[PDB]
Subunit: 115 residues, 4 copies
Amino acid sequence: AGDTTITIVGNLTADPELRFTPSGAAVANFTVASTPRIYDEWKDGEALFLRCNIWREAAENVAESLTRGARVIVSGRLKQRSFETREGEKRTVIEVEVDEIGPSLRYATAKVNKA
Amino acid sequence: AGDTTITIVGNLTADPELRFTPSGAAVANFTVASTPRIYDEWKDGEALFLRCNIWREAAENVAESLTRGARVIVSGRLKQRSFETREGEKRTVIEVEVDEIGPSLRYATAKVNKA
Amino acid sequence: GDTTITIVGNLTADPELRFTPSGAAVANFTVASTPRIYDRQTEWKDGEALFLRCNIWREAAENVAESLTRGARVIVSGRLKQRSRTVIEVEVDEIGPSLRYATAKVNKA
Amino acid sequence: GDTTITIVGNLTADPELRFTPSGAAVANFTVASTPRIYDRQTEWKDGEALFLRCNIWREAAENVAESLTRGARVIVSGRLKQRSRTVIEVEVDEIGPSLRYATAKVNKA
């Protein structure tokens, strides 16, 4: 189905965690901190931390290509979930299923190596 | 600062709530339910409910132009917040500060009236 | 895999409605998006102005034809496509009148 | 107020680096985005292929020049702008190599 996609630019809060599923598929998890502009001065504002995940090869590349602090351009779709019941109440979580990710060449360089 | 914007299409979970601030400014709140495609059949999947808010005039127009069920195209920026402390723990909320919103002409018509 | 974009702007003129030889409806129109420029506390101004032509099909274009006219403010979500010289247009997925400076009485099908 | 878009694709060829008469660096390149087509359980295929030319300035274009070459897969975030006949290009805000089929050793400034 897909729908509702977003593009976010920010830095990894920590190194990408690459763990393997029993089926052989790799999963790369990382949260992206997107910290805004400035003015007059210059003031960092708001900030948005989004939990991301990517699989297969893309996941492995990511794991051995990015580290904590890396500024990246992320594209993917937004996924939400909700909780409940009469003894406590309503909780909401959200994540991004990354379609593509790359380190930003805004404040850095990098020598790419296709396979 | 801005940054991280999104565009979502969906239906209002309920009529837009228009309340007035003591300062005279109007606030329009509404949550958008974005329910996905299908196939083979046809299966509604995932679903994403996003709390939106718009002010000033745009807010008032919205309030007297849209109702529960209305299919709309929303554009704006994503805003997140986080909670905490040693007796309970971590909670996260998110909202969209609408820049522009309009009813969709995908499954309907509407006669617009500029002011 | 398509490249999607969202654009806000006004209709260069009344939407053009036609019918392919098969019967399918087709509406062509162009949106003029005018930018932001500032100085903040020293007067803002509008930008270069971007003109993107849009196409919409089936029962949706029939809705555009019926609701939108010249100079209407609209928000468009679609996919960039380039023709065959060779221009870049937008195949509309969703479109509706912006409620920024206007109200509207919607009517479901 | 600008119209922003995100595009994935490969570099039509090595990036073109030049310097305005003032000294500012400028990199021009074009991204070829190739779509998705399917049948699901009956073989998928790629689409029409969109070609958008991109420009990037200052110390960022100097980074593009140094990291990207012909055929590299990249993800671009920018703003649509139309020139003066009259074409539509993308003024890049951020760009980096897609890690879909490749790794990379980044190096902060």
